[PDB]
Design a protein around this ligand. Structure first.
Ligand SMILES: Nc1ncnc2c1ncn2[C@@H]1O[C@H](CSCC[C@H](N)C(=O)O)[C@@H](O)[C@H]1O
Ligand SMILES: Nc1ncnc2c1ncn2[C@@H]1O[C@H](CSCC[C@H](N)C(=O)O)[C@@H](O)[C@H]1O
Length: 463
């Protein structure tokens, strides 16, 4: 039994947290797992009345020895899960705990959310703080029964919690805050102390609809494994480092307008807009790509806009853009000359096009390369011929560079990093995700080594 294991464990065995908890001056507070009263004394000094509870007799007795002089505390030795624990429903302004749910089974956490919402009055708060993430228990002794859960579990249990009064008003919990104890630092290892603040609200939601919405988002998230390999914000060759190199060639001036054809999740667009004070118009055929772009754009003050659109059918007025930019997108486009003629009209006189794209050697594709091209739906040309297409469309000063050596260098570095981080990659993602990346990068390196696959950089300008 969980109860016996946790009780046995516990038988053998601050200003920041208080600053985080909802206002408690004058209020009715229930402290669960009070221990010897590290918080109890502080709470009581401002609270109207406190109930301090712990299932270890000696702990709660020590609490009473130290804090008993505060006459507004009632002390209880009880297990929070016990049916015999009697606390008047709707009587509590604030339920406070600090390390507690980690000592309950998964089903008991669900039980406790229900007990807690019952105990708190409408408009009241629940605060809890737990040690999270499985790896937090790697160095744990076999007889340490502490549950180090993924934070998503606590969020989901409490967001689905529902109850009724008599008769028969529905109540749920809204999430007021989720906070990292000691302040969140990006990429910082071992930040596992997390707290939540929930408020009891009058509402009846359909949890199946919420699960549906979350599941739609989860299904759309495959692109994140590619972002992991390329770099935050990027889903093509070389991430930020290649983007910085190529954007420099545009000579972007403040106030210019850039079209990004195949904008993906927007990282290159944020980079251009923020660093060069240009307006970027980004289009991508994928709803899911644009969803991430829009989300990462929230809060940014740079001038970017994103739309789901097919670049082969989208229309813009003549002379709309100073620059048309595209990275590893146009291999999907079957009629490049038509696309380029459209680019020529969209660009203002004096404008510029910059494209990187997958290409092939001039030689006829091997049967294996041809089948790959067909399955993927690609339209590949040699670098010189691609350049000629830009010339044919009316562009001047066409530069067409074979950058395959750079492509290979970048592929090798991208693959090596994933391989060296295999365990974490798999924990964050999955084994199948890891295999997809390693397999795909290995195959690209095979096709480059055979001499069949190429990578090109194209720059041209208009009149
Ligand atoms: N099911 C349960 N019912 C009541 N108390 C419990 C419990 N499971 C664990 N506890 C108590 O929860 C406390 C956790 S340690 C933290 C104590 C205090 N909240 C503070 O932060 O200082 C322990 O004292 C333990 O005895
Ligand atoms: N006809 C089309 N119109 C617009 N985008 C297209 C398209 N065909 C393919 N794409 C998009 O082209 C993108 C290529 S991946 C690269 C995205 C981004 N430029 C970056 O470098 O990170 C994909 O997101 C894909 O959805």
């Amino acid at each position: 039994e969980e109860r016996d294991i946790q009780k046995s464990y516990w038988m053998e065995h601050r200003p920041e947290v208080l600053s985080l908890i909802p206002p408690y001056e004058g209020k009715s507070v229930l402290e669960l797992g009070a221990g010897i009263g590290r918080f109890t004394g502080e709470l009581a000094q401002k609270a109207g009345e406190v109930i301090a509870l712990d299932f270890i007799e000696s702990a709660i007795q020590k609490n009473e020895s130290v804090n008993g002089h505060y006459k507004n505390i009632k002390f209880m030795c009880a297990d929070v899960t016990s049916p015999d624990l009697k606390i008047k429903d709707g009587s509590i302004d604030l339920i406070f705990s600090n390390w507690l749910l980690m000592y309950l089974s998964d089903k008991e956490v669900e039980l406790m959310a229900e007990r807690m919402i019952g105990w708190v009055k409408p408009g009241g708060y629940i605060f809890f703080r737990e040690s999270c993430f499985h790896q937090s228990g790697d160095s744990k002794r076999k007889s340490n029964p502490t549950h180090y859960r993924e934070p998503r579990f606590y969020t989901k249990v409490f967001q689905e919690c529902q109850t009724r009064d008599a008769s028969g008003n529905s109540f749920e919990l809204s999430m007021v805050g989720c906070k990292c104890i000691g302040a969140y630092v990006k990429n910082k290892k071992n930040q596992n102390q997390i707290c939540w603040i929930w408020q009891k609200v009058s509402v009846e939601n359909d949890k199946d609809f919420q699960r549906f919405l979350d599941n739609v988002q989860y299904k759309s998230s495959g692109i994140l494994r590619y972002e992991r390999v390329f770099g935050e914000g990027y889903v093509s060759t070389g991430g930020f480092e290649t983007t910085k190199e190529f954007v420099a060639k545009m000579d972007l001036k403040p106030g210019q307008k850039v079209l990004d054809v195949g904008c993906g999740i927007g990282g290159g667009d944020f980079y251009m807009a923020e660093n060069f004070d240009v307006h970027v118009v980004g289009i991508d055929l994928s709803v899911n790509m644009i969803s991430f772009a829009l989300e990462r754009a929230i809060g940014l003050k740079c001038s970017v806009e994103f739309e789901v659109a097919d670049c082969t059918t989208k229309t813009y007025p003549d002379n709309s853009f100073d620059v048309i930019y595209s990275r590893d997108t146009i291999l999907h486009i079957q009629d490049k000359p038509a696309l380029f003629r459209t680019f020529f009209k969209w660009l203002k006189p004096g404008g510029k096009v910059l494209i990187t794209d997958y290409c092939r050697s001039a030689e006829t594709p091997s049967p294996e390369f041809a089948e790959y091209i067909k399955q993927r739906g690609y339209d590949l040309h040699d670098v010189q011929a691609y350049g000629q297409m830009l010339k044919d469309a009316g562009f001047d000063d066409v530069i067409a560079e074979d950058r395959t050596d750079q492509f290979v260098q970048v592929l090798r570095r991208e693959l090596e990093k994933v391989e060296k981080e295999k365990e974490e990659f798999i924990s964050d993602f999955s084994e199948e995700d890891y295999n997809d990346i390693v397999g795909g990068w290995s195959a690209k390196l095979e096709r480059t080594a055979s001499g069949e696959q190429k990578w090109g950089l194209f720059i041209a300008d208009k009149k």
